[PDB]
Design an enzyme around this catalytic site. Structure first.
Site, PDB file in Angstrom:
ATOM      1  N   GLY A  70      -0.901  10.276  12.450  1.00  0.00           N
ATOM      2  CA  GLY A  70      -1.331  11.192  13.491  1.00  0.00           C
ATOM      3  C   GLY A  70      -2.636  11.843  13.072  1.00  0.00           C
ATOM      4  O   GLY A  70      -3.309  11.340  12.180  1.00  0.00           O
ATOM      5  N   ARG A  71      -2.920  13.025  13.618  1.00  0.00           N
ATOM      6  CA  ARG A  71      -4.131  13.768  13.252  1.00  0.00           C
ATOM      7  C   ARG A  71      -3.812  14.680  12.063  1.00  0.00           C
ATOM      8  O   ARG A  71      -4.705  15.254  11.484  1.00  0.00           O
ATOM      9  CB  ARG A  71      -4.627  14.605  14.460  1.00  0.00           C
ATOM     10  N   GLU A  74      -5.747  14.540   8.454  1.00  0.00           N
ATOM     11  CA  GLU A  74      -7.099  15.060   8.361  1.00  0.00           C
ATOM     12  C   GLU A  74      -7.169  16.554   8.056  1.00  0.00           C
ATOM     13  O   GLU A  74      -8.173  17.009   7.512  1.00  0.00           O
ATOM     14  CB  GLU A  74      -7.932  14.711   9.593  1.00  0.00           C
ATOM     15  N   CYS A 100      -0.235   4.414   9.074  1.00  0.00           N
ATOM     16  CA  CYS A 100      -1.279   4.839   9.991  1.00  0.00           C
ATOM     17  C   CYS A 100      -2.455   5.637   9.315  1.00  0.00           C
ATOM     18  O   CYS A 100      -3.191   5.047   8.487  1.00  0.00           O
ATOM     19  CB  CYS A 100      -0.608   5.597  11.128  1.00  0.00           C
ATOM     20  N   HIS A 101      -2.636   6.920   9.620  1.00  0.00           N
ATOM     21  CA  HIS A 101      -3.675   7.741   8.982  1.00  0.00           C
ATOM     22  C   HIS A 101      -3.156   8.426   7.745  1.00  0.00           C
ATOM     23  O   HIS A 101      -3.925   9.060   7.032  1.00  0.00           O
ATOM     24  CB  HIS A 101      -4.225   8.817   9.946  1.00  0.00           C
ATOM     25  N   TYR A 120      -3.875   2.448   9.491  1.00  0.00           N
ATOM     26  CA  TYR A 120      -4.341   2.297  10.871  1.00  0.00           C
ATOM     27  C   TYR A 120      -5.633   1.498  10.762  1.00  0.00           C
ATOM     28  O   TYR A 120      -6.502   1.870   9.973  1.00  0.00           O
ATOM     29  CB  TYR A 120      -4.641   3.670  11.505  1.00  0.00           C
TER      30      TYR A 120
END
Ligand code: TB
Ligand code: TB
Ligand code: TB
Ligand code: TB
Ligand code: TB
Lengths: 166, 166, 166, 166, 166, 166
Positions: A70-71, A74, A100-101, A120
């Site tokens: 997801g975000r 970060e 993913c991330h 990702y």
């Protein structure tokens, strides 16, 4: 085994919830760590309760680590304490699951040079610049590091990770 | 001048709309390139019409490049043609403006080794691993490359970019 | 110059954010006034900090006025103090920029009889009933009053307004 | 085993996605049936590909059945063919997993009178009026019928269902 | 007459708002009861103020009862006090209007056995298992019980209910 | 009586749905006219079917007119045909109900000078500039014109309108 999740708001919902239940099925104790106590909410609106904060985590007390996408990564990757937890557990050879991330946190920990894995595809160039041998596969197992790309890979991701925990 | 924008759905709305109007004020011709023809929609729901597709772009026909942020750069950076456009224009010394996640396209183009600039701080480690001397500043001007971090930097971002187009 | 913005929740996001950054680029000091302190949120979800309340505005302290659109002007125009600010600044010949529904505040101030300008076309009959000579143009300059219709006019709107603040 | 899912739009996202991947980890072939053969969307916005329509399902070709929750069962349970599939598969003693609102389909199939199980507590009175011996437990195993209540029960729900598919 | 509404968050907006205004037109006093004081929000985002909580309702001081639909009845029907309000008022022969999922509250009250009515078709099997003679009609009047299915029936629903309160 | 509604997308949902059902209760035939056939969608997401376009409306064929609010009146009022329908029916003395932004269509029709009524308070000054004697009341009856301000006024709005259709 005690499994730690490093996550935050805007996590990819199924990438947290799936390994959470899959590892509970095995009898493992699962702990969600984030910035603050209370709740966090996924990109799709699922709410999860935070068990502890990054500042209160002693990585010695946990046996394995899961890094959903997801975000959230970060923001997590700018937190020195969260990155230290991932740095220590990964370098000690403890099992680490990323999807993913998720591995953006491992990039920031500086632990991926010469390691083989996936993510990702949108961040494959960042993985490569971090020294990863990047593979386009639904799951990669490189010693202690089990990595997958997207939610369609969930079945294979935890199929390999569960073996590492027993 | 003819200014090209490389973008896609889930662009950060103001990071596209602000430079679009700011450079139209100067009398520059502004062109939005994306995957397909039609419209693209920002994170916050603003719609913008696509002027041409990446396949139809001749980089020699354009004088400058703008790379807005949002989640769009992670999709643009997997398009070989879009990355080639950014590679060519940047390496030819044409003016390039990036903000937020925008420089992920420049990372994938392989053109930032030894350069100085900024980004969304959440990707500073990826910028550093791409060989950037990363700076925490509202705007950085490194020859032809004008970079900014977030929407709060818009005023300074285009203040410096318009200077390169005149 | 010191530039005041009269606005409220449900402002048209780009109509506030664009002139805010455009005028900061010139070195003008930009102040957002609303009902209460804290923040306000646009129709599309952008948040902006309020610098002062209508009650604490002394119009003599400001050199120019900006009136963005959205559904915010219909709230502002019912506030006696906000309308008085617009009345005083406009009638003193200070530069006033309006776009879209922005001039509804000027209608309520009673200062548009015999003036020439534009607005969102949806309120042209209200402009005409207030005594405006309504024009269908991207920007109109009538002495101190710079008016535009829609977000597609932003580039021309501030191109003309910036000239008045020199 | 070939495992069939009967679902529709506004399915509870994790209640479909979790068993889908969990059963796929075991090597079971998983099939999503719905009204039409394209894409369905969960209450939280996850999209899943429909493999076939109810009209094309031959229950003899499937070994087990999963009934996720959400608002979808209230649509599925008004389809004669979907209800017939659940009626046959359940009455033939094939493994059936239900969670949350999923057993509304089994209520409509008329196969629950005298059986023991659980559901979303909000529909316990409907389960009881259908002749169920309703239990407040994270998972109930009643011969071929494995039932759970809510997403928090996912781990125990598929722990028991997988055991029945071995 | 004094009319009581038993509802909660995720009520179907028009199924509450329509009878609320329609009964106010007649001069009736309308009261919204829910779990807590403050506001509740419908599925479509309309906000409604709560007049009393379930615990502070005396059913002797109300003449009529309205049970709107949406996802709210599945919450209300697990509240023992809300269910006994509906149980008492319905069994005393006071006028009760239900639409859509509204009668789930009456199912949980145990008052519908032998009675004739309708509901959202998606729960017709639950109504039947509760002993209702279920009818597919826009409005049913069974003594004190006026029932309708969906928002398209609003006109007929209150047309009949208003007669019972004149 | 035959009742026409002039509306468009972004109508205020309850301001259309409430009088629609309320006039159907009386046995009146209700017709929704808009730009095109098909469906229109309200601000809160309710969908309604269009019965005819403004071009096929013959105002002789209708006995009464309803003008709901929302953002729809600002679209409708730029349509010469829709404004003509409202102009003809209102000037012929047929019953006309307006609420909220609804009377913006009557302002554009030029029929309100010397009339007494109300509206959304945000457009009071536009009503006054159109020559209305504006009143702050939940409902005003001025011969054939019944007007109200906001959704909280619905009960009183149609209470008075229904009396005109005998
Ligand atoms: Tb944060
Ligand atoms: Tb796409
Ligand atoms: Tb028993
Ligand atoms: Tb067991
Ligand atoms: Tb009273």
């Amino acid at each position: 085994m005690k499994v730690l999740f490093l996550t935050a708001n805007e996590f990819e919902d199924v990438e947290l919830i799936y390994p959470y239940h899959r590892l509970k099925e095995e009898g493992h104790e699962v702990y969600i760590a984030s910035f603050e106590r209370g709740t966090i909410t996924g990109k799709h609106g699922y709410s999860v309760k935070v068990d502890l904060t990054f500042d209160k985590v002693n990585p010695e007390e946990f046996d394995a680590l899961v890094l959903p996408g997801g975000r959230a990564p970060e923001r997590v990757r700018l937190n020195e304490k969260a990155v230290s937890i991932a740095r220590k557990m990964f370098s000690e050879g403890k099992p680490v699951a990323s999807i993913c991330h998720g591995p953006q946190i491992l990039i920031s920990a500086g632990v991926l040079r010469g390691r083989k894995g996936t993510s990702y595809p949108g961040i494959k160039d960042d993985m490569i610049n971090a020294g990863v041998e990047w593979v386009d596969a639904e799951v990669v197992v490189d010693g202690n590091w089990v990595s997958s790309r997207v939610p369609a890979d969930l079945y294979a991701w935890m199929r390999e990770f569960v073996k590492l925990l027993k």
